[PDB]
Amino acid sequence: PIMGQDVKYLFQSIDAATGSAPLFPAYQTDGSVSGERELFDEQTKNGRILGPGSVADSGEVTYYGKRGDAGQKAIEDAYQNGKQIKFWRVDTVKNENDKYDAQFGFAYIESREYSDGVEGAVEISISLQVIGELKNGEIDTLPEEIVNVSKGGYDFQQPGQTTGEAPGTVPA
Amino acid sequence: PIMGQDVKYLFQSIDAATGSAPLFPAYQTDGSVSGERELFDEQTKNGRILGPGSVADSGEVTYYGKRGDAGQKAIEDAYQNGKQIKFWRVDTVKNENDKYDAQFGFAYIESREYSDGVEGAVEISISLQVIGELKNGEIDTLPEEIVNVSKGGYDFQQPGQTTGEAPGTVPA
Amino acid sequence: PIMGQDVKYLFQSIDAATGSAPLFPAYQTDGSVSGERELFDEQTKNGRILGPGSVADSGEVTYYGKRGDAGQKAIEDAYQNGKQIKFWRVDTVKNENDKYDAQFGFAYIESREYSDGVEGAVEISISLQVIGELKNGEIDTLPEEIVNVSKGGYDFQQPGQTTGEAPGTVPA
Amino acid sequence: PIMGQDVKYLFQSIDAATGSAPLFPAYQTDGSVSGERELFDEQTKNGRILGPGSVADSGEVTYYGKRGDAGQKAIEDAYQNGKQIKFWRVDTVKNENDKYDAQFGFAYIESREYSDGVEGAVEISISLQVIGELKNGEIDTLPEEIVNVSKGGYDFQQPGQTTGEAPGTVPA
Amino acid sequence: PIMGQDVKYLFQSIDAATGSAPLFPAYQTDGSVSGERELFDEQTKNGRILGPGSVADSGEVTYYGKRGDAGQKAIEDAYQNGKQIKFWRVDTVKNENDKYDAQFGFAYIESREYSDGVEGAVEISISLQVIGELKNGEIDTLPEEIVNVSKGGYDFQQPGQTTGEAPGTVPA
Amino acid sequence: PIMGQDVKYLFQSIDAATGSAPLFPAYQTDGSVSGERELFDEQTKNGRILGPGSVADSGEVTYYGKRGDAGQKAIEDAYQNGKQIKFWRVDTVKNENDKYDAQFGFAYIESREYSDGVEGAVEISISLQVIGELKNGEIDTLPEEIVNVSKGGYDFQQPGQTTGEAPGTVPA
Amino acid sequence: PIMGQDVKYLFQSIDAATGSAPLFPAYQTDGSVSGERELFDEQTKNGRILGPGSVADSGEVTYYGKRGDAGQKAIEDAYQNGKQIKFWRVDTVKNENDKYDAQFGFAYIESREYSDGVEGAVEISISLQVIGELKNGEIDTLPEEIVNVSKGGYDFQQPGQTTGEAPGTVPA
Amino acid sequence: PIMGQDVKYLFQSIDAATGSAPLFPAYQTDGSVSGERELFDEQTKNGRILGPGSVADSGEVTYYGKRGDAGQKAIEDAYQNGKQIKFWRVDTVKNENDKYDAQFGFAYIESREYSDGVEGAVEISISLQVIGELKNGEIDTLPEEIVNVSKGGYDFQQPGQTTGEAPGTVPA
Amino acid sequence: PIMGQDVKYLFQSIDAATGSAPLFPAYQTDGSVSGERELFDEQTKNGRILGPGSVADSGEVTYYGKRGDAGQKAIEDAYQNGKQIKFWRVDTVKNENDKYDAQFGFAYIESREYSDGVEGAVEISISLQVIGELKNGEIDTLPEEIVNVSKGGYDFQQPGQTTGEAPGTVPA
Amino acid sequence: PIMGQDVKYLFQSIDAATGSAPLFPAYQTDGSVSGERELFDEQTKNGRILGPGSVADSGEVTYYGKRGDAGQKAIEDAYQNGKQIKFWRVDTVKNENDKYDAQFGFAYIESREYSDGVEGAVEISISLQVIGELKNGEIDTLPEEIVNVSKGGYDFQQPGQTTGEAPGTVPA
Amino acid sequence: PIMGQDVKYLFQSIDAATGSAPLFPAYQTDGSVSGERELFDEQTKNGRILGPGSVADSGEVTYYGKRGDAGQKAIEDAYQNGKQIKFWRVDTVKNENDKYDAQFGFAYIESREYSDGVEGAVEISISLQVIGELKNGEIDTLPEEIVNVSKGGYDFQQPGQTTGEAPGTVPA
């Protein structure tokens, strides 16, 4: 069906106007908790609980902060300076009508609470509020996170690897 | 007696008007919590706890989201667009007067909160409110979820399987 | 002393007027939580804590739902239709003045909350409110639940068992 | 020092007027939680927190219900009928001025909440309220619970034991 | 006394209604491990060991798989399709009140774990679960496994054996 | 000193009232594992090792099942039906104050787990649980297991032995 | 650095006027939770959260009650009768200006809640309120709890120890 | 990326005016929980949740107390006397524009709650409030906590170490 | 160096006040397993493993039960009745400062688990718990176990030995 | 097929950038344990085994430490200083498509645990972790370990060997 | 290469300031097990196994206790009194840059568990913890354990040896 790796959250800044959708890697658990309230009276009857309510949809997105890769710096530009976020919930599996699919929203951060442990690495917890989801199922997701994530390790170069962990470079 | 597999929740959309009852497969745990309040005074006596109250009956239905099989798209059509759900709580064991039996209701979703983990696959949690259950024990349940769930694995075809996991197809 | 099996709850419907006391089989844990409040002041003194209060006695009765045996349908006739319950808390050990003994009450259900799991079987939780217990220790409990619970297994019939789990029947 | 077995709770009914102090056998964990409030002020200063408050002292006494031995029936005479309790907190170690010592009070039950499990035996939880502790350290505790608890098992009588668990009887 | 050959496990299907009791030959070791739990308590006393427990009685039955002889096909019909087993622990020695004697049960399989080695022959391990054994000393055990197991081999047929290993047939 | 044959376990049923003490023939190894717990604490000190604990003394009693000799049927009456055991750990050597000496207890069985092998004979493992051992050094042990165990074999009766293995009977 | 043993709480009664500082031994975990509030506004700005607040400093002191050693009787004289406590938080490590050091205060007990378990020994929990800590780092701590805690065990006296656990006495 | 060791909190007093940034060693877990509220109405619409709110950013900084190293005494000068703190959140990894980078703030302590256990060492918990973070990424961090944390153990001096744990001194 | 015979465990009762140190004959393997805990920390550093822990020192003392020689009855007086033991770990070789040397303690028994085998003799396992070993090198060990153990056997007494196995007595 | 000598692990440092691939000689047992997790779920169905898992492949590489040959010094530079390893699993037999073949990775050491025995020589155990193996079948393996391993020893040099064990050098 | 005799563990006290390095003779097996933990993450990727962890390096040092030779008395001064150890892992083979080489540390003892057998001699097991090993290759190891260990035995002195086992002294 749909795995815990099959869904990722493409983020886009309000000020770039560049069609790339930088999602930030090293994810963790997530959440799109869609809380829709509802009217209730009794009418001296069994109840009138059928009535609708306003929908407030939150997001608990957790990840790990890498030392560069300024998409999270755009997240902190949205939070600490004060902006909003173009928010995309896209999938990894291939559809046959579109390429992928999504739940879309213009989101605003409640809180950016990150833990700095001792043995565990740091983890950024981020809350989200959005007005209402919008099912903008689209096609191009700029595939640097779907097929690009292949093995981690690359092939070799015996005289000239000149590399730490993140593999595959020319000598100097 | 009745096992944790012996009870499933047949759903039907308000707009289909089609007698098929699409329940959505790949379930998880459930809940039909029937909270009925009660008038309580003391009357300068031991109490008047005998008095009835209004019944508000909720449902915590959890499952896993499959990439197709649009019954859950009818769930999200009822939630996100805003509709109601024809709700059926049917059993799997065979009765001797009817075929199966049920607790019935016209239900309305509070919240659709799904978790996107990392190692575990995604899980959809859904809350339900219903006015009052109605014991419409009926017969036909369109048996694609009672006897049809048999083994998962199918027989073989050695020169011509041409199949991934979900078995049993012709070569093209 | 008194074991966790030594106490069972004989139930009786308000409309049967039948002297049998059908308790329901396949129990789980229970609880008779007797919450009595108290007149609590200070009176410019150490306190007037000695004063009594109203007694509200609840019960958390859990069991497993069996596919027949309509005593639980009498429970649901008391709950969902709206009635009351004749409630008996009897013991299994043999007294020397009476046969058994009891804590008695006319009870009313708050809530009927059952869980439908996946691997665990379904479990019915039921809350109870009663005005006040009454020590009607009586004799006859119709012993189909005291001595009749003996082994589960019966002897055999090799050419003629014709039986599934619950043993001991004639050939058709 | 003082063990968890070294402290037991001698109880006495208000209506017996008999000097025996029936404590109940087969106890469980306990608690004498002494909550004394205090005048909490500031007085445009660092605080006036030195001021005293009223003392409300509770007791969470748990035990297991034996099928006879009517001391617990005197507890239920204090609770279900409605009375008060003469409450003694005595020790097991031998003093050199007295025999034993105690914290004393006239107590009143909040609640009698007992759990009836399935495999675990039943356990009676009892709450207590007292005006104020009083250090009436006395001598005689009627030693059927200090030195009498020795082994449980007794010696034998091979042609004539005629006994179940609790040993040491004559043949009929 | 009683040897390791003196006890064999006669099996019977729930669906046959045939008085034959097919045990399956080529046995290996067995086990009827009767784990009855208990309430061990401390009670500010020496202890409250009196508490009985539920009896969970398992069976480690190992044997060798023969290419026919459909008793093990009835075992796999009870396991893989999902049924139960009429279980018999009978003895080989001759009693004087009955013919033989037994510990009886209605069993359900935990696991059917068989080892396919290389040079050792294949061996089937089967776990068993029963509510409670029942001392059903009976007489007829269809003696094809008490007296009929005599040598393995037979005497001779010098002109007209015409057989493989297991001797004693007419020529074609 | 004391050999592994010098200590045997005389048993007695709770219902017999017969001074015989049936121990069982063809014993195997034993065990009286006396686990007394303790309070070990630290107290911002070196330790609070002073605390005694409850003593739970188990027994691993193994033997071989003989086809009669109903002392093991008294064991299975204590276990499979549900009773207790009068338990005796007596010695074989002669004392000068008494005849023999013992550690005594009232025991309750955890488990009765016997192995049915193939070539080794069957062996019964029995777990035991007692409140506390009691040093009841007594005299009479009904000497059919101290001096009577001499050889097994006897001399002869050349015309009229007419016996199987266990020798020494009259002709028919 | 500072161990969990390196800090102990020297207590002194208000009525003794004796320079000995009886702390009570057999400690357990502790706590000096210093809750200082703060002026909390916004002032149509980012906030005025810089502003100070009143300090309320509590102490969760847990220990085990020894049968004598009346420093805890001075604690119960402060609580149950109603007094105050001179409170010292001193260290065990040696300083090079002073001997030891302290966080000091005049404290008042909220609550004295002790648990009487079954297998665990009793444990006294005590809450503390103090106006404000005062750093009266002093020298003499009457070293019977710093260097005197050495091993617990003492040397011997083979004809004349005459002692239980707490060692080292003359013969009577 | 960024490890749990890669971020440390450089502290500076308001009164020193010394460019050293004494952070206190022996850290534990941390936290910079940035709680920013938001304007919340509905306007007879889907909602006006887009509106910003005030940011209150807290810090849970835990560490272990060392017997000297008076930076924590400057923390206690800020708390117990009443001052403020210059607060730096710097990274350990090397940047290529600056040396390191930081999140800065002028902070004020809510509470200083430390635990004194028995087996575990003491642990200081400290809460922080700050108006707003300021991204003052600077260069020099006085590298006695970035490179100087190398091994702990030093080389040797066999005739003349004269040292306890923290190694490397001259003889006297 | 030091052989397995060179170290023996002299015991002394708490109630005897007799300078004899009864050790027991026919010892078996031993053990003084000194488990001292420690503080294990990481501290955003290489570690703060420095922390000492409490020392909990056990003893696995195994021997063979001789039918008399009541030192083991003093052990069973310490265990089964409930007392403590004066514990001695002395050596056999001669020193030049003292006669012998020792590691000393005051011990308390966890468990007394002895095996009653069949063909091996019985063996007693005893667990020990001590606060802290103390290096009490002393002189006199009452030499009936250092020099007296030479052969067991003696030379002869041809007319009048009149002895069983352990030789050397007068006629009658 | 493939023997236990036919596979060797070529190692390369991250800092060398020299095309030599130093494996370290005197191998012992190895291991590439490829642990790929999975999602096994139940779904009120037969199961949902479809879920892939992350793959964590470990290496148990054991060898013997030679006194020089600095490849193991590069291992200890990766472990004790802290680096990573370019990891190679190559084969010894000659292929016809390439020269040799391999499973490749970028590895990081868990532990370096070596045993220093007495009568056996020392042995180094090393654990390995890799993100993902990659099938990099390549050609050149610098043949000092494929064809060069011929005997260990050489033929002879009768006058002028002048060598220790490892033969074949010029005089001086 | 390197034999099990080629590596020995030179010890030095923290209080001596004597350049001698007393190792203790009669070694047995050893161990320096270097457990360095790591961050193990999945990150909706192939993994983030990259994270370094803290190194906890232990030592299992076993030897035989000689009756003098106070190096082990310095070990017991570190354990039983409470100190630390200067720890040396040096090699026996000769280098050409230095004489020998080492892995060095400052160690603290977990446990000192020694076995006192019967027919085998005693053996001491000692556990070690160190912050971090440091590669301190040095020259002088006080060669009384590298070259001086030659045979054990010496040549002769035929009239005037006058010695026990370890030979080579003057007459008297």
Residue numbers in the entry:
A (entry chain E), B (entry chain F), C (entry chain A), D (entry chain B), E (entry chain G), F (entry chain H), ...: 5 to 176
Question: Can I see the authors' text?
Answer:
In the Siphoviridae SPP1 phage, the tail tube consists of the TTPs gp17.1 and gp17.1* in a ratio of 3:1, with the latter being generated by a translational frameshift adding a fibronectin type III (FN3) domain to the C-terminus of the protein. However, virions only containing gp17.1 are still viable and infectious, indicating that the additional C-terminal FN3 domain is dispensable for phage assembly and infection. gp17.1 monomers are unstable in solution and spontaneously self-polymerize into long tubes in vitro which are indistinguishable from native tubes. Six gp17.1 subunits assemble into a ring with the inner 24 β-strands forming a β-barrel that defines the inner lumen of the tube. The α-helices are arranged almost parallel to the tail tube axis. These rings stack onto each other with a rotation of 21.9° forming a right-handed helical, hollow tube.
For cryo-EM experiments, we purified ΔN−3 gp17.1 which is indistinguishable from wt gp17.1 as judged by solid-state NMR. Curvy tubes were observed in the micrographs. For image processing those tubes that appeared most straight were selected. 3D reconstruction (see “Methods” section) yielded a density map with an average resolution of 4.3 Å. The local resolution varies significantly, from about 3.5 Å at the inner ring where the β-strands are well resolved, to worse than 5 Å at the periphery. The inner β-barrel shows nearly no motion on these timescales—which correlates with these areas being highest resolved in the cryo-EM density. The global, collective nature of this motion does not impose heterogeneity onto the cryo-EM map since only straight tubes are considered for structure calculation. In the context of the tail tube complex the C-arm of the superjacent subunit folds onto the outer β-sheet of the β-sandwich fold by anchoring the sidechain of Gln162 into a pocket. This interaction obscures the lipophilic area whereupon the complex is stabilized, because the number of unfavorable hydrophobic contacts with the solvent is reduced. Overall, our hybrid data support a model where the C-arm (143–176) and the loop (40–59) act as bellows contributing to tail tube bending by stretching.
